[PDB]
């Protein structure tokens, strides 16, 4: 039964990137997937997406480039303090020069270096590189 | 897939995109409510009310021609039965299984399906207690056949 829509959708686009497709249709639509693909497009790893609107839970179709390697997820949502950000980004990021981890905060859904420069933590949501 | 059956399945309705009444139907919403009243006075279940209202007069859905659903109108007037129709059908199926098992003792599969039906009853009764429809002291025992239908 479907509970975590985010993990299934990101594993779907991960398998689409691994196989070699260019468009993929993920079935559920939440706000969190819209914000995650939003910051995904902001940080330049994938192509521009389309969201189809129905009178139900909608779908998202994404145009894929070959710049992404892995689109993981963390379940459940562990809280992350600012002293413990290096603990996660040392053993989960592949390098310090790239690889970008996202955590939801009181301000919005946003990555780790912007959370460092505005000094606000929150629970962890997912990661990519 | 199914809750008790082993296999999966995919067979359900698919309402269209348009939230609009059909243009070719001039059947007034007050009149639609009047057939809902008289077919409910005939003594049917709201699934049967919906399928006959879709069938004869050819309306897409009650929710588009009106603002409510069928059971909302029935509880607005107050002639709806207090027992839910799915619980009524499941209790009637259970007492039919009990009447079948009254004469047959070695039929183990009927007893197994009886345990499954009682499990489904106990699973749905706590939801109908939780959403505050049924009284909190209501319970389905093994002997309620002359008082409960």
């Amino acid at each position: 039964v479907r509970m975590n829509v985010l993990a299934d959708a990101l594993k779907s686009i991960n398998n689409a990137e691994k196989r070699g497709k260019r468009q993929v249709l993920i079935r559920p639509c939440s706000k969190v997937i819209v914000r995650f693909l939003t910051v995904m497009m902001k940080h330049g790893y994938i192509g521009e997406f389309e969201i189809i609107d129905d009178h139900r839970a909608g779908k998202i179709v994404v145009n894929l480039t070959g710049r992404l390697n892995k689109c993981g997820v963390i379940s459940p949502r562990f809280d992350v303090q600012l002293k413990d950000l290096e603990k996660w980004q040392n053993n989960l990021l592949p390098s310090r020069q790239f690889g970008f981890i996202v955590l939801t905060t009181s301000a919005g859904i946003m990555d780790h270096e912007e959370a460092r420069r505005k000094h606000t933590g929150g629970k962890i949501l997912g990661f990519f590189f | 897939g199914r809750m008790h059956a082993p296999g999966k399945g995919l067979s359900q309705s698919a309402l269209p995109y348009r939230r609009s009444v059909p243009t070719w139907l001039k059947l007034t919403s007050d009149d639609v409510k009047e057939q809902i009243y008289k077919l409910a006075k005939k003594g049917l279940t709201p699934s049967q009310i919906g399928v006959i209202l879709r069938d004869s007069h050819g309306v897409a859905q009650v929710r588009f021609v009106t603002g409510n659903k069928i059971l909302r109108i029935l509880k607005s007037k107050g002639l709806a039965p207090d027992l839910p129709e799915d619980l009524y059908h499941l209790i009637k199926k259970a007492v039919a299984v009990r009447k079948h098992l009254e004469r047959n003792r070695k039929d183990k599969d009927a007893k197994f399906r009886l345990i499954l039906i009682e499990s489904r009853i106990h699973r749905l009764a706590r939801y109908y207690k939780t959403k505050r429809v049924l009284p909190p002291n209501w319970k389905y025992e093994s002997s309620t056949a002359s008082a409960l239908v």
Partner: protein, 141 residues
């Protein structure tokens, strides 16, 4: 872990506790039967009295006989057998002498060529076997 919930802490703690307690190297130290079975009681060295000298058999690819001295302790009076390590050192031990029995090095296992022993001898007549073998000192009489 198999269960990856947010609020499932002592399910996994109980599973770790049970499968840690169901080990062998962990169960060797946390049960009193192992300490009650060892005559040393967790002691490194122990004192004992020699009552006889016995020749023991050996293993299959190396056929010989080895020299084991039978040592009776003072903790419980248990009758155990030790093993004289070096060459030509059996004649220094006779009946009714105090010796310092110790371990051997495999946590109470029969080591190598000699079956049925797990301890050796370090001192005899309050002087070490190394002194009596190398001729560092002289055995008192």
């Amino acid at each position: 872990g198999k269960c990856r919930g947010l609020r499932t802490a002592r399910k996994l703690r109980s599973h770790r506790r049970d499968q840690k307690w169901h080990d062998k190297q962990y169960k060797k130290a946390h049960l009193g039967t192992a300490l009650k079975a060892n005559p040393f009681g967790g002691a490194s060295h122990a004192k004992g009295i020699v009552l006889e000298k016995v020749g023991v058999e050996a293993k299959q690819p190396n056929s010989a006989i080895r020299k084991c001295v039978r040592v009776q302790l003072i903790k419980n009076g248990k009758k155990i057998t030790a093993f004289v390590p070096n060459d030509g050192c059996l004649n220094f031990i006779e009946e009714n002498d105090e010796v310092l029995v110790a371990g051997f090095g495999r946590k109470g296992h029969a080591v190598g060529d000699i079956p049925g022993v797990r301890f050796k001898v370090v001192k005899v007549a309050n002087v070490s076997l190394l002194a009596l073998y190398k001729g560092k000192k002289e055995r008192p009489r």
